[PDB]
Symmetry: C3
Amino acid sequence: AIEVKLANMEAEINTLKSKLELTNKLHAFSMGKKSGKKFFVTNHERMPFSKVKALCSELRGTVAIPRNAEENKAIQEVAKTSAFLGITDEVTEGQFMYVTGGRLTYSNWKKDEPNDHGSGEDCVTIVDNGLWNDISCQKKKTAVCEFPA
Amino acid sequence: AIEVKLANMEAEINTLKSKLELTNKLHAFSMGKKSGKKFFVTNHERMPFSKVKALCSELRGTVAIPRNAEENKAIQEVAKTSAFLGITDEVTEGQFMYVTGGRLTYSNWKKDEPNDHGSGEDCVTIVDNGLWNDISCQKKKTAVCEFPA
Amino acid sequence: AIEVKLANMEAEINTLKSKLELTNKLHAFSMGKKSGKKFFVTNHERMPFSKVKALCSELRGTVAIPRNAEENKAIQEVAKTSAFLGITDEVTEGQFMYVTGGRLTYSNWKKDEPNDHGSGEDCVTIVDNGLWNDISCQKKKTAVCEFPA
Ligand SMILES: CO[C@@H]1O[C@H](CO)[C@@H](O[C@@H]2O[C@H](CO)[C@H](O)[C@H](OS(=O)(=O)O)[C@H]2O)[C@H](O[C@@H]2O[C@@H](C)[C@@H](O)[C@@H](O)[C@@H]2O)[C@H]1NC(C)=O
Ligand SMILES: CC(=O)N[C@@H]1[C@@H](O[C@@H]2O[C@@H](C)[C@@H](O)[C@@H](O)[C@@H]2O)[C@H](O[C@@H]2O[C@H](CO)[C@H](O)[C@H](OS(=O)(=O)O)[C@H]2O)[C@@H](CO)O[C@H]1O
Ligand SMILES: [Ca+2]
Ligand SMILES: [Ca+2]
Ligand SMILES: [Ca+2]
Ligand SMILES: [Ca+2]
Ligand SMILES: [Ca+2]
Ligand SMILES: [Ca+2]
Ligand SMILES: [Ca+2]
Ligand SMILES: [Ca+2]
Ligand SMILES: [Ca+2]
Ligand SMILES: [Ca+2]
Ligand SMILES: [Cl-]
Ligand SMILES: [Cl-]
Ligand SMILES: [Cl-]
């Protein structure tokens, strides 16, 4: 019976969809995702900002964005080394924007930064003690992605 | 056509189901699951027992339960801090029961425990050295979930 | 309906395939896979060689094999303790081959190794210093699987 088989296929597909979602939930949890909080993941590879951005988008996430101290601390702990943040002033020098949109609100700049040093620095890294510093987007820094809460 | 197209699709689904199962095995392995041993995992978040029960059930798992010394050690090494166990005497004071049913078969109580201290303590936490202490279910401890061997 | 439901199911299956691919990409990333580089994974379990082979095959991978100084270091870092390599001279004493097939293209043998000591040693482990040493395949060493770049 073709219709009986089609209904089974629907049931099979639905079952699969539910299991894949459970697998994603389990993975996030094992990656340290706290309930109702976005989580961060890194492979500890250093690369230019454009590569991090491409990579994270490929994973349906975005370059990590600290929107408060807790998140800043979380990113610092995941990264373990200097890493790019999803913040840049490439569009208009001096005005930092999130890669996903909007002007920067919470910030944790290191003393005397951002300084757009020399020829210029339009990207941002989370460095020592979790403070931030603007740097050339061409530099290679750890890739840390954030995924929705 | 229809029947052939349908049969081909059923084959595709079966293949996808196998792939997901492989994804699950590899995830558990990368997370430290030992062959033939239960898989214990945590996000390192502390929360009330009710929250833990909810979280693990949502992942289609259960609150970690040590049935022997080997499992107690395994849970201890996953939690790294104090964590709730799936054991309570909430229903009947003095008689600890697994959240999945049954009376205790193995216990590892710390000296002077269980004491049902003060207003009463119905939940169990695996603390330092792997020893157990009964505490208020409302207190916040690490969430450790258990998955099949 | 029939044809419409069937065509939709096809799109549903195709959507699921993409999602699972994404899940696999994200999991590899979480496991530390570097772009275009092969990656090694371990659950840190010690078992005999036959078991390692069986387990990695079950994960659709192969027992870790260092093709150069770089990979040799990479494996050593993942394992943390002496692990088996996908190299043995089981077939013909003295002729070490990859479990995947072929003669050695690279090797980092310690002085006077391999020596087929005593009752015999047909397996190889990466010691806690990069060097190789042939050991008994019955010994329990850390299981490290390798997946392609
Ligand atoms: C007096 O201000 C500081 O001057 C030094 C020297 O010019 C700055 O450091 C240089 O910054 C360059 C930025 O592209 C580059 O990294 C230089 O390295 S190298 O010589 O090309 O190898 C580096 O010496 C310094 O900038 C800060 O520190 C840098 C290391 C870099 O992280 C910048 O983003 C920082 O802003 C200046 N510091 C301040 C506080 O103005
Ligand atoms: C170069 C050589 O001949 N070395 C001998 C040495 O074997 C090496 O070291 C072992 C520990 C082992 O890793 C071997 O694979 C190395 O080639 C001998 O050591 C003994 O080796 C046996 C066989 O594995 C065994 O491990 C012994 O330990 S046991 O007693 O616990 O079983 C180990 O001592 C050494 C012994 O005389 O002779 C060296 O010439
Ligand atoms: Ca600029
Ligand atoms: Ca700038
Ligand atoms: Ca700067
Ligand atoms: Ca399953
Ligand atoms: Ca009680
Ligand atoms: Ca009690
Ligand atoms: Ca107590
Ligand atoms: Ca031999
Ligand atoms: Ca040999
Ligand atoms: Ca030897
Ligand atoms: Cl720049
Ligand atoms: Cl209580
Ligand atoms: Cl052997």
